[PDB]
Amino acid sequence: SKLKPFFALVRRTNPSYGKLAFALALSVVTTLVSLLIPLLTKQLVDGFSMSNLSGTQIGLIALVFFVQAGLSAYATYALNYNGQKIISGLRELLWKKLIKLPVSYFDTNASGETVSRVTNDTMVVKELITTHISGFITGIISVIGSLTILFIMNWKLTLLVLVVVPLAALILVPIGRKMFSISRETQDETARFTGLLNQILPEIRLVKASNAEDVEYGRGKMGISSLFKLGVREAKVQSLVGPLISLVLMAALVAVIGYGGMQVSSGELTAGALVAFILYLFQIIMPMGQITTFFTQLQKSIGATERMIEILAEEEEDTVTGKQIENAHLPIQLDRVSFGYKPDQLILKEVSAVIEAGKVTAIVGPSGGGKTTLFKLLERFYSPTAGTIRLGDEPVDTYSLESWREHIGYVSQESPLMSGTIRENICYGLERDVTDAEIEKAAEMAYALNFIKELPNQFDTEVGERGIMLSGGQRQRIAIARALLRNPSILMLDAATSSLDSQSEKSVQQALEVLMEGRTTIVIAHRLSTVVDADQLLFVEKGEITGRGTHHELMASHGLYRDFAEQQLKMN
Amino acid sequence: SKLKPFFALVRRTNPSYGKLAFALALSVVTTLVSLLIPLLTKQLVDGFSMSNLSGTQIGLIALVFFVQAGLSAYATYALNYNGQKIISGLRELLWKKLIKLPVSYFDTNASGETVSRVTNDTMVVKELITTHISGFITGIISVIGSLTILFIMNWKLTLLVLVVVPLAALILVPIGRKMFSISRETQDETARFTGLLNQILPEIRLVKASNAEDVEYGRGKMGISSLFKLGVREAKVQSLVGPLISLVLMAALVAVIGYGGMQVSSGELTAGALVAFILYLFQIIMPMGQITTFFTQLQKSIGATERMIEILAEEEEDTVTGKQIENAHLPIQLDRVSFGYKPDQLILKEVSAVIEAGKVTAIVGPSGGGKTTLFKLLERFYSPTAGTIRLGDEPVDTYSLESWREHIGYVSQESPLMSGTIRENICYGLERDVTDAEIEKAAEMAYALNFIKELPNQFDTEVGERGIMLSGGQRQRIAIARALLRNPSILMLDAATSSLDSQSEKSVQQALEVLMEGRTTIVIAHRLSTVVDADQLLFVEKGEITGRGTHHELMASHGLYRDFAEQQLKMN
């Protein structure tokens, strides 16, 4: 039942069954050859009289060993290659999913956790498919075959002693758990002492000033004493684990092998049987670790598969709504919009507003209100539930989301880099129009070519994977150049305007004011520099729009009491 | 040569030799008994036939086993107990030295690293003392004795094969190293892929905004393809290693033990010597890990010893200079003080000033000048080199450094607490006077009891190890009180004044003004609130004192041109 999701996940990469089955069967054959090797050893050792004729047995054993090595090598290569192909397919599906369907809010939930889950679960699935399932089949077959062959070879006497010895595990394993518990307690006490010292030492100034340093010494003494006491207890428990373990193991060892020697000396049908017995004991003991590791890795992998299938279950639409974009220039209306992240909370309540076309609109919001929710809302990163964000006659649910996103230019505050080269930063505006070779010319129009006129290069200019050698002012100029290049129709801005000061702000204002003199813009930042360039201003408070009209007189009057109190809170 | 520092460092805890030597000798005799066990096994095997004397041999073997168990248990307990006493002594010495001597600038050189060298290095030294040295001695003795006994037992035939076999390990090692290199390459490429993915997700907003969801998918696919290629290479190299390890190890085991059976069957004198040989082979193979680990950990132990001896080398003085304090009320004068942290840099140049006694003095410094260095110099953590901070005619050269710090109470806005209870906080200065039981009365005069009048308790009030449940103003007020009870003769202030607001600042200022009017006071902080209360002010610029006199008219004039520009920079 629980293996059905894992089988389906493997089935997503369909052409991966025949070669896996062949590899597993070949591994089984290799295990059987390994089982057969000690019988050849016994036959050789019983052919004692003719050393020269024992050369034939030596050659046969060498040939069998080489055949086993070759078969195991081919099976391992097939298993690993098929597992790598399965992992490539799984990662391909996961990356196709995460980038495309997961909506912005899903990525806001957890960014690093998503990547950690993807990588760790893919690695765990690889480890399960390539090694642990084949390892478990190999171990089970080897153990069963070895026990059967020992039963056939020795009558019962040595083998029942061997199977009784596992009682040594019943005597040893629980004591190891007590050892582990004591060691963990010691580690905890050491961590506590380290924390105490890491607290005391940085405050050394206060101690030395207070002239109470010796008192701290006394406190430190106590800590040391504590650890010493615990150490003593560990020592005592060690004196119960150190010898005893060895004793039991050695005793068990002797018993088994001792009986073998007994059966050799008593004339019982054992000799080469004893040699084969020791080899079979090795081949029995070794795969138990593989079996236990598989049993634990299955428990890890079922949860890994649950996480992966949780990732793969998300959904989204891009052009499913329709395709009805023709002009995308018409006044934008908010009509009774009331929706946030979850319908229960209702973080937005009946938000309505009117904005003209080709008209500059500013948004002023508080530190903790609904400015961020609205900012994401006029980007449609959230799906409307009750209200209507209507461009014209509610076509926003009618045409494609990609079509609108193509007609809008976004820069909020940082928008740092898409790592690579500036060629990537200007080629993100390649919507099948490839922009021919005018990009640099556009950089000249966007006041970016003259700024970049130093030219370390144009295509080999690397910002680096980290992207730290270029400051903010240049990168927002590049972002605005990209926005102008792409599709200067509608711009929504959170004002990249920061601590750049006069030169950068004036340059961006001249670039923008010239560019959108006939195009619609929205501004949502805090400062009052864009609002004077904004012919219409709004205000967000408690998840509600409160304020409409022009800037000067209205925010001279509307902002007299409550917005002024909010400001006085802001600088304070 | 290199072991002399470690021997001396252990010698610092002198009475730890005889019992350690006895424990080591008992471990040696335990190893000898372990060597003796297989010979008794062989004698039992040769007895084989008749029953009751076989029972006597079994009883002898059990007695030898239990004797080994008891002796090993006692040796392990003695070794561990002596090691824990040694580690207690070492940690005690380290904590004494660390708290008492090192002057503050040593502690600010490195804080967490010092605690790490206190804890982890001691753990390494204890591990070497308790287990690894005894482990190495017992392992070398066991290996040599087992080889010698095998040489006596089997003439040369089986042991020569056994010692020629390590050619198998010689072949094995380079292949394992290539495995490790390929695994590290895989880890590195997985790290790069995770870094790429962790880079992309934060920029998901831009990715969707630029409608470029597919090229980013393509970059992810390229990364997945690179990882798949490297995984295929890892598979091709893996398919050779594992089969080779299995083949070579199984072949060596088959060779050795099949030759043992060859001798036991050929009528060669290997009757029960085969069983004895297998037991001795296990006793040989098992202790190789200890011998390898002793060599691995020796370098770490020697490094830990070097770090400890480096810790123990720092020197300092408290009352060595002299003892000539009588009243401790004289005007403080600076005489061409020129020194910072290192003589070559000369971060201070001929700093001189005149400050009266019982007069409040405030210091004004820039953001990056010498205000902090002069702050720490007035509190004299630093030892003068060229100039002289002269208070009292050079008796400042010959009274106790400690005796002065008695007369000064340190309070700053940073200082959170010393973790524990309020009782410790108010009575840390039990400078042999213990203040009888005047602490509560002291609180009531010093405006602490009336503020703490809520009384969760007076002695059980715990501020916690973290100390997060109380705000800065309260702890600053308790620190001011503590200054008022240690020795209210000289006061130094960084102005505890923070964001508490006039309601607390004026109150604490009037409290200290009433309490500390007739005695000296020193202020160094930024604001201009204590400056009006300070009779004389100074100014620090470029590591030089520039400005002396009263407050109002002079910094109405002196601060008009240059200090005003610094202020305008501060607000900007």
A73 touches chain B (CB under 8 A): yes
Q: How many residues are recorded in chain A? A: 572
Task: Please tell me what resolution, in angstroms, this structure has.
Answer: 3.7
Closest CA to B272 of A519, A277, A309, A257: A257
Inspect the interface and report whether the beta carbons of B99 and A69 lie closer than 8 Å: no
**Which residues does chain A have within 8 Å of residue B85's beta carbon, measured at their own beta carbons?**
228
Closest CA to B562 of B394, B280, B364: B364
Inspect the interface and report whether the beta carbons of A65 and B247 lie closer than 8 Å: yes
CB atoms within 10 A of CB B308: 23
CA distance B565 to chain A (A): 19
CA distance A1 to chain B (A): 31
Which of A278, A432, A489 should one mutate to test binding to chain B, selecting the residue with the greatest count of B CBs within 10 A?
Answer: A278
Residue where a domain terminates, one of A319, A341, A374: A319
Which of A36, A76, A99 should one mutate to test binding to chain B, selecting the residue with the greatest count of B CBs within 10 A?
Answer: A99
Do residues B315 and B328 both lie within one domain? no
- A 502-561 near B (Cβ less than 8 A): none
Strand order in the sheet with A332-337: A351-355, A332-337, A388-390
Strands B520-523 and B360-364, by their bridges, are parallel
Do residues A332 and A475 both lie within one domain? yes
**H/E segment holding residue A491:** strand A490-493
Q: How many residues are recorded in chain B? A: 572
What's the CA gap between A545 and A529, in Å, rounded?
A: 21
Inspect the interface and report whether the beta carbons of A224 and B198 lie closer than 8 Å: no
What's the CA gap between B316 and B306, in Å, rounded?
A: 20
**Which residues does chain B have within 8 Å of residue A410's beta carbon, measured at their own beta carbons?**
205-206, 209-210
What's the CA gap between A520 and B542, in Å, rounded?
A: 53
Q: Which amino acid is at A14?
A: N
Do residues A200 and A161 both lie within one domain? yes
Inspect the interface and report whether the beta carbons of B431 and A211 lie closer than 8 Å: yes
CA distance A267 to chain B (A): 10
Do residues A161 and A253 both lie within one domain? yes
Q: Are B150 and B35 in contact (CB under 8 A)?
A: no
Do residues A388 and A280 both lie within one domain? no
Do residues B363 and B279 both lie within one domain? no
Q: Are A20 and A82 in contact (CB under 8 A)?
A: yes
Strands A388-390 and A360-364, by their bridges, are unpaired
CA distance B553 to chain A (A): 30
**Chain-centroid distance, C-alpha B146:** 43
Number of domains in chain B: 2
CA distance A192 to chain B (A): 11
CB-nearest to A81 from B88, B206, B232 is B232
Do residues B47 and B143 both lie within one domain? yes
Inspect the interface and report whether the beta carbons of A112 and B198 lie closer than 8 Å: yes
**Which residues does chain B have within 8 Å of residue A84's beta carbon, measured at their own beta carbons?**
228, 231-232, 235
**H/E segment holding residue B491:** strand B490-493
Tell me which chain B residue has its CA closest to the CA of residue A191.
B119
Burial class (CB within 10 angstroms; exposed 0-12, middle 13-18, buried 19+) of B316: middle
Inspect the interface and report whether the beta carbons of B250 and A65 lie closer than 8 Å: yes
**H/E segment holding residue B335:** strand B332-337
Inspect the interface and report whether the beta carbons of B95 and A210 lie closer than 8 Å: no
Beta pairing partners, B360: B521
Under DSSP, the state recorded for A495 is: -
Burial class (CB within 10 angstroms; exposed 0-12, middle 13-18, buried 19+) of B172: middle
Domain hosting A100: range is: 1-319
Show the 3-state SS of A195-231: HHHHHHHHHHHHHHHHCCHHHHHHHHHHHHHHHHHHH
CA distance A41 to chain B (A): 7
Alpha-carbon torsion, ordered A319, A324, A328, A332, to 10 deg: -90
Closest CA to A363 of A558, A494, A483: A494
What does the angle CA B467 – CA B469 – CA B471 come to, to the nearest 5 degrees?
90
**H/E segment holding residue B492:** strand B490-493
Residue where a domain terminates, one of B319, B346, B361: B319
CB atoms within 10 A of CB B455: 8
Do residues B241 and B309 both lie within one domain? yes
CA distance A187 to chain B (A): 11
What's the CA gap between A162 and B224, in Å, rounded?
A: 49
Three-state DSSP state, B142: helix
CB atoms within 10 A of CB A542: 9
Do residues A275 and A343 both lie within one domain? no
Do residues B263 and B374 both lie within one domain? no
CB-nearest to A431 from B211, B224, B482 is B211
What's the CA gap between A337 and A335, in Å, rounded?
A: 6
A105 touches chain B (CB under 8 A): no
Q: Are A58 and A78 in contact (CB under 8 A)?
A: no
Three-state DSSP state, A517: coil
A91 touches chain B (CB under 8 A): yes
A197 touches chain B (CB under 8 A): yes
Inspect the interface and report whether the beta carbons of B419 and A199 lie closer than 8 Å: yes
Do residues A122 and A207 both lie within one domain? yes
Do residues A5 and A63 both lie within one domain? yes
CA distance B499 to chain A (A): 11
B243 touches chain A (CB under 8 A): yes
Q: Are A75 and A23 in contact (CB under 8 A)?
A: yes
Tell me which chain B residue has its CA closest to the CA of residue A253.
B279
Which of A239, A466, A522 should one mutate to test binding to chain B, selecting the residue with the greatest count of B CBs within 10 A?
Answer: A239
B99 touches chain A (CB under 8 A): yes
Q: What is the CATH number of the domain that holds A376?
A: 3.40.50.300
What's the CA gap between A204 and B83, in Å, rounded?
A: 30
Residue where a domain terminates, one of B319, B345, B367: B319
**Chain-centroid distance, C-alpha B347:** 31
Burial B428-452 (b: 16+ CB within 10 A, else e): bbeeeeeeeeebeebbebbbbbebb
**Which residues does chain A have within 8 Å of residue B43's beta carbon, measured at their own beta carbons?**
none
- A 282-341 near B (Cβ less than 8 A): 282
Inspect the interface and report whether the beta carbons of B95 and A262 lie closer than 8 Å: no
How is residue B301 written in tokens?
A: 């132990």
Tell me which chain B residue has its CA closest to the CA of residue A403.
B211
- A 14-53 near B (Cβ less than 8 A): 34, 37-38, 41-42, 44-46, 48
**Which residues does chain B have within 8 Å of residue A215's beta carbon, measured at their own beta carbons?**
428
How is residue B276 written in tokens?
A: 């004895």
